[PDB]
Design a protein around this nucleic acid. Structure first.
Lengths: 386, 64, 136, 61
RNA sequence: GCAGUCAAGCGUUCAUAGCGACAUUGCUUUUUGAUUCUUCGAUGUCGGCUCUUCCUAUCAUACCGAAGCAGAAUUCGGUAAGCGUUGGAUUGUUCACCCACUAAUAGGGAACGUGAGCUGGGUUUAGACCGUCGUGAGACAGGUUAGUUUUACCCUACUGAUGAAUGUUACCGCAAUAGUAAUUGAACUUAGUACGAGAGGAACAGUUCAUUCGGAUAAUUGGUUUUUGCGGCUGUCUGAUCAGGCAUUGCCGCGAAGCUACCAUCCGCUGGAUUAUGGCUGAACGCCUCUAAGUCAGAAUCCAUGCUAGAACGCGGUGAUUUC
RNA sequence: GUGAACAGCCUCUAGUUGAUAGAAUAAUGUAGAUAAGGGAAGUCGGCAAAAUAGAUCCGUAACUUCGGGAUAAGGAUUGGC
């Protein structure tokens, strides 16, 4: 017979094999289509998140009912050290798509990423790359032909970058790497752009600006070998039942006498490499400079760091870049920020959108206060003398 | 700004924090946290609660 | 929902399924109407259809004035007593469970809604917010 | 005699995924591996050059 | 049960707009028969719950054609199974028959799907009552109440997770192949306007939200409590007090962290090729024609951009490669 | 001792520390819990669970074989000094 009452299918089928991913860092599938009349700038960025905060806004939605009248909105803030680029690698066209025929490092490679290639540091005599620094000791007699072997060849060239852990309170002491597509143009100075940016950093406003639609690519947090009710979402069978209470009931018919790939049973939940698209940016704020949590008319010199710091991460005095909603992944991860794929139409981008009140309230409690100088003169003088 | 000073302990209400309890007799009761509201379900008068500013003002502690 | 919508609603936190005893709140004579459905809701198996704030439910009467009895009435929820948020980010919730007898185009049967009124049935049903009392 | 025991980490030095620590059965093997030393040394041999060309375990009633 | 051939005629007039007399040719194995080929040293043989896929003989959606279609509503059809198809009362019910809403509340098969998945309400036990039959034991596809639902640690399948060998070891990638997901509705508007002289009453593009599903996140709210954090209270025991035990976590109130909720918030991409159908050019056939070669547009369809896994026998660039 | 109580709960005299142990908390379990907003809409069926519950005061209908129903139903108070 049939199934007597039709219903949708629990759980998406095009996300399995729902398996724990490669590393903490997630790879990026794609990049925007290059157009070679554009200035050379890198198209995706590497950073860490800290934890989300709260924002009120001033809606420019003509037609709706909260036009020019208040809302709250959930922003998250991902922060970033000034990341720094240490070499390009060119991919040539081939019937097998892309293919690495180059690699070119800096001369002074930093100790934070001579950390990275080793996996047992202190016992080593640290001797990575010390025969590769011999090539730069001449005028360029092993690289100028090598960069000529990436000017002439390698129709797509992507450059690799590495973080600054030494300016970040994440106690890892071991940086990371990636690649980033270069979507400017003029391929043989798209090479020579990176030839300049050996041994120099790059900022966060170097890749993004305000009021634009970023695209998030990251990894998910994980919860272990989870069952079947949380995993897919199927129904709890009734209280009366025996051999369990929250299993899946029947798996298949008699024929086919082999259980499907389409049936919902237990296993791994979380720590997949998910994604989430079309997130809105608000404020690519500089960290060192004046009053990064001072909006347009609060006029109160403060930080974006909440009172007592963010929980499990500490304070941000580095660069930070805040994102509407919820990027996939919990605090202290390597979340990356791809740019768009298409210039929007739905009047959700293509506006300006303001900002009215960032917070500082203690997110390690049900906090009340906005400045440690504000609860001082509100309560008075405590038994602690002033 | 959109500040509000609530109706159980004189605490602070910011957009993005707090609750609101109307009554069938049309009386709003803005609170901040559920400590200041679960006492109110139990009917705790704020003038005999040792941390409220309604009680704090009434015994000469920090006014002159 | 539908028949008289001079605009639209946002989503309110729906917390009154089929079977709700909502207390009638006007001078239609019968105090106590019993909900049987909603209007404008979808379907999946073993899911009770739930009533919102401000929507037009269809809801029979149970006791009261013995002329509008033993029939099915069209109704409208006026206040909910479930902690919805609104877009300003404040969490209102009433105490009562209200409801007014109405006829399908959407201006109700009685003459005086008593007590408070949830403020977002103003634009959805404007012909009964004129006959309201204390709103918000 | 592998089946249905847990994986460990220390076994991958020998190129296997699963292992154990049979703490009792080891203790009767030392009781021979100085006894075999106790008469190989006390035959006339040296004591720093031996190895075990033939170890054997067969089951008792 | 479903589908055609004819065409007496109904349909003011008219055989086919819509049906179709008296016939006649089939299809299906979801009805129920017919036979007894396999199981009687045992296939657990009604119905419901939960869960996946498949078939279309489309109920709604998408696009289109024909109407005795002026518009709304509607009646047939065409490509279409991609995606949807419900909540209750009564019964053991499949069926039945109503109360509702929405887009509709389509039909079906997977040993009359699914009992080492479940409940046991029915029938196939033993107890008991009634009615009829029988002299009597007893019978009745007649009724009525109570009646133990056994094992997985095997292999395979599947969902997850390791790993030798490949000069070592480490990093950075590449993508064969496989899966793939978003779906529909309302109001504002166009507009009381095109249509109808009237009653009535649309459409496209914009919006602004909603319904169903999926993936995430914990800023705020709510649920959580052994953080046994703080305070309170009971009975008892530490001679009294301060501080504590013991009451299966003694109970209570609040409760940070953590997990989680359409009980909260956020997010859910756009190009190429097509089918029906409509055409152009155009014969066959001095015309005529969408077709026979050519040719354009074209659906929720197909394949790509995206989204996930990365072949552990598919591979590419780079660093260092034991003075003991 | 609390209490009406040989109920439950803690201690004194007497006995025992006997139940294979170590480590970290995944699924599914067994035993024990709690849960907003609706309240039987689930199901063969309120099965299971939840709710009052001790005591004092006021009251307590039909029906009846006048003995009963009846703690009927219902409402209030409860500490310490």
């Amino acid at each position: 017979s049939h199934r007597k009452y039709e219903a949708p299918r629990h759980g998406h089928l095009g996300f399995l094999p729902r398996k724990r991913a490669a590393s903490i860092r997630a790879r990026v599938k794609a990049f925007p289509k290059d157009d070679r009349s554009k200035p050379v700038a890198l198209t995706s960025f590497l950073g860490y998140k800290a934890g989300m905060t709260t924002i009120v806004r001033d809606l420019d939605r003509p037609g709706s009912k909260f036009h020019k009248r208040e809302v709250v909105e959930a922003v998250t803030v991902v922060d970033t050290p000034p990341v720094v680029v240490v070499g390009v690698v060119g991919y040539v066209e081939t019937p097998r798509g892309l293919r690495s025929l180059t690699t070119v490092w800096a001369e002074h490679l930093s100790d934070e990423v001579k950390r990275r290639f080793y996996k047992n540091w202190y016992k080593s005599k640290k001797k990575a790359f010390t025969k590769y620094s011999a090539k730069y000791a001449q005028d360029g007699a092993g690289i100028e032909r090598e960069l000529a072997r990436i000017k002439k060849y390698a129709s797509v060239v992507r450059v690799l970058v590495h973080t600054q852990i030494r300016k970040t309170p994440l106690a890892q002491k071991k940086a990371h790497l990636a690649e980033i597509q270069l979507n400017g143009g003029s391929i043989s100075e798209k090479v020579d752009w990176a030839r300049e940016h050996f041994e120099k950093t790059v900022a966060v406003d170097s890749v993004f600006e305000q009021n634009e639609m970023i695209d998030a690519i990251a990894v998910t947090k994980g919860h272990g070998f989870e069952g079947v009710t949380h995993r897919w979402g199927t129904k709890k069978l009734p209280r009366k039942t025996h051999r369990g209470l929250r299993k899946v009931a029947c798996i298949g018919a008699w024929h086919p006498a082999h259980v499907m790939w389409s049936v919902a049973r237990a296993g791994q939940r979380g720590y997949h490499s998910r994604t989430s698209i079309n997130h809105k940016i608000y404020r690519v704020g500089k960290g060192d400079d004046e009053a990064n949590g001072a909006t347009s008319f609060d006029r109160t010199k403060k930080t974006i760091t909440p009172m007592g710091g963010f929980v499990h991460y500490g304070e941000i005095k580095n660069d930070f870049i805040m994102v509407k909603g919820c990027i996939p992944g919990n605090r202290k991860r390597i979340v990356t920020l791809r740019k768009s794929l298409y210039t929007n139409t739905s009047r959700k981008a293509l506006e300006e959108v303001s900002l009215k009140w960032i917070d500082t309230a203690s997110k390690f409690g049900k906090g009340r206060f906005q400045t440690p100088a504000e609860k001082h003169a509100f309560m008075g003088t405590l038994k602690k003398d002033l | 700004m959109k500040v509000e000073i609530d109706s159980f302990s004189g605490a602070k209400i910011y957009p993005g924090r707090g609750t609101l309890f109307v009554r069938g007799d049309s009386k709003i009761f803005r609170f901040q946290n559920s400590k200041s509201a679960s006492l109110f379900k139990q009917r705790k008068n704020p003038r005999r609660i040792a941390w409220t500013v309604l009680f704090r003002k009434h015994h000469k502690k920090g006014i002159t | 929902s539908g028949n008289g919508a001079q605009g639209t609603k946002f989503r309110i936190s729906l917390g009154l399924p089929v079977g709700a005893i909502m207390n009638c709140a006007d001078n239609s004579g019968a105090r106590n109407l019993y909900i049987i459905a909603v209007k404008g809701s979808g379907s999946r198996l073993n899911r009770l259809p739930a009533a919102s704030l401000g929507d037009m439910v269809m809801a029979t009467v149970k006791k009261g004035k013995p002329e509008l009895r033993k029939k099915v009435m069209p109704a409208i929820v006026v206040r909910q007593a479930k902690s919805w948020r609104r877009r300003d980010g404040v969490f209102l919730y009433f105490e009562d469970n209200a409801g007014v007898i109405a006829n399908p185009k959407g201006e109700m049967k009685g003459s005086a809604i008593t007590g408070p009124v949830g403020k977002e049935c103003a634009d959805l049903w404007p012909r009964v917010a004129s006959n309201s009392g204390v709103v918000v | 005699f592998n089946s249905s025991i847990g994986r460990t980490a220390q076994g991958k030095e020998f190129g296997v995924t699963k292992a154990r620590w049979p703490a009792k059965s080891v203790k009767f093997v030392q009781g021979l591996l100085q006894n075999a030393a106790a008469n190989a040394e006390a035959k006339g041999l040296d004591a720093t050059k031996l190895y075990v060309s033939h170890i054997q375990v067969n089951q008792a009633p």
